[PDB]
Design a protein around this ligand. Structure first.
Ligand code: HEM
Ligand SMILES: Clc1ccc(CO[C@@H](Cn2ccnc2)c2ccc(Cl)cc2Cl)cc1
Ligand SMILES: Clc1ccc(CO[C@@H](Cn2ccnc2)c2ccc(Cl)cc2Cl)cc1
Ligand code: NA
Length: 400
């Protein structure tokens, strides 16, 4: 159990973790009460945990979180990045406010901007080989999130640094190794800098509001107690990291899969309407978010496996998506299959509010990319980041 998880953590396996994921799933649920940890990997088990009324997202109920806090020799810096309690009503209230701005029909209005952005980025692409990450996959969703949150493009390099650091902090290193990350100090600093910057931006938007989402949230904060400044900072932290470290991998993973599967790139190049099917199959086959976690709010049962109160439950979504009880030929990338209702955007009370935006960004980017370069070929094996949870490529080289 410990061995297989350590192989999964090993950066050398990031390029292809799926043989390990399948091996973990076939081995069944991993019960590790000694490390306050349970690991689920089948579709049934992951679904059940995401559904369970006792499953908590709040860190206060985590035993590992309580142990980590007790061992620390200094107070954590002020801000939601270190700590913010939210009861179920707080969470529902925040989702309600954010969901209106991220509704598919509101997000749809960003298509012209996204289309012009995709066209300009592709116009800038030079042969004989280019890095898809640098040229399209990364800068597109970054430009969209910066404009949506009203963040100045001049400060983007600093927002890029903080998002990369905080996206890596979501790796369950403490739950799996027993010790904290080697980037812990930098992640703390990035959290501090973001807090101070967003606090300064919030104040500026009080005096001089814009048409951005941050300015919209400030107006709600200013109109009544329905929203606090800390809640705005927490929300904007989440959105900013989502904008930098998620869609990039949906776009890039899909491009990679099409290049690795004979005829798939050509098919999309000849028929743009295949975009949606390619995207959903990428969400299943090579998910941008590889895993999620929940904490047992009380003693609970998943199937026949009991989880003690306070323990962390890691859900290996990448493994769940290749479960032979839910999908035929699970380890094959096939956009022409009868698609499953995958867990790539989560589900229930915590379902991804950015799903419409992510889908829209990819739906514009991918078919334009294939149509622009129908002759495209993967020139070499891709280069991956250390990230396990928000897993992605730093280099995806395409020959043109
Ligand atoms: C393809 C890209 C994306 C993927 C694969 C993805 C995946 C996910 C998943 C799996 C969850 C559930 C977390 C859990 O259950 O613990 C989630 C939550 C969330 N996502 Fe995304 N996401 C993406 C892009 C985005 C974007 C671009 C935004 C907006 C900027 C966004 C906003 C959110 C928010 C606000 C939540 C929290 C909802 C809640 O806690 O109630 N996501 N995402
Ligand atoms: Cl729409 C929406 C808006 C905001 C949140 C809050 O999300 C929490 C995490 N959390 C806790 C329980 N479920 C997720 C959070 C995000 C960022 C920071 Cl820096 C700190 C915290 Cl505590 C959730 C949904
Ligand atoms: Cl300091 C800080 C604290 C909390 C967050 C939340 O980060 C979100 C970003 N995200 C990713 C996809 N959609 C949104 C997130 C990360 C990992 C997972 Cl598994 C799920 C989620 Cl919702 C970010 C920074
Ligand atoms: Na949540």
């Amino acid at each position: 159990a410990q061995g297989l998880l350590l192989q999964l953590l090993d950066p050398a396996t990031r390029a292809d973790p799926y043989p390990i994921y399948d091996r973990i799933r076939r081995g069944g649920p991993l019960a590790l009460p000694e490390a306050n940890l349970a690991v689920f990997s089948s579709f049934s088990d992951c679904d059940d945990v995401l559904r369970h009324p006792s499953s908590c997202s709040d860190r206060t109920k985590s035993t590992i979180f309580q142990r980590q806090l007790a061992a620390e020799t200094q107070p954590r810096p002020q801000g939601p990045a270190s700590f913010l309690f939210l009861d179920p009503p707080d969470h529902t209230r925040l989702r309600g406010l954010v969901s209106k701005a991220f509704a598919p029909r509101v997000i749809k209005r960003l298509e012209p901007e996204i289309t012009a952005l995709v066209d300009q980025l592709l116009d800038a692409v030079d042969g004989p080989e280019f890095n898809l990450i640098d040229n399209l996959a990364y800068p597109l969703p970054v430009a969209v999130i910066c404009r949506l949150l009203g963040v100045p493009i001049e400060d983007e390099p600093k927002f890029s640094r903080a998002s990369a650091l905080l996206a890596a902090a979501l790796d369950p290193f403490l739950a799996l190794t027993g010790e904290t990350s080697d980037l812990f100090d930098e992640q703390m600093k990035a959290g501090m800098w973001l807090r101070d910057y967003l606090r300064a931006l919030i104040d500026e938007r009080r005096r001089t509001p814009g048409e951005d989402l941050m300015s919209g949230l400030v107006a709600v904060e200013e109109s009544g107690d329905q929203l606090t400044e800390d809640e705005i900072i927490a929300t904007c932290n989440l959105l900013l990291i989502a904008g930098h470290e998620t869609t990039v991998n949906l776009i890039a993973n899909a491009a990679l899969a099409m290049l690795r599967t004979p005829g798939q790139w050509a098919a999309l190049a000849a028929d743009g309407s295949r975009a949606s099917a390619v995207i959903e199959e990428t969400m299943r086959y090579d998910p941008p978010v590889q895993l999620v976690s929940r904490y047992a709010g009380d003693d609970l049962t998943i199937g026949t496996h009991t989880v003690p109160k306070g323990d962390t439950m890691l859900l290996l979504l990448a493994a769940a998506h290749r479960d032979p009880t839910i999908v035929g030929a699970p380890d094959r990338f096939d956009p022409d299959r009868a698609q499953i209702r995958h867990l790539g955007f989560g589900k229930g009370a915590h379902f991804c509010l950015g799903a419409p935006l992510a889908r829209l960004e990819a739906t514009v980017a991918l078919p334009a990319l294939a149509a622009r370069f129908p002759e495209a070929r993967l020139s070499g094996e891709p280069e991956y980041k250390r990230n396990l949870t928000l897993r992605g490529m730093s280099t995806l080289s395409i020959a043109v």
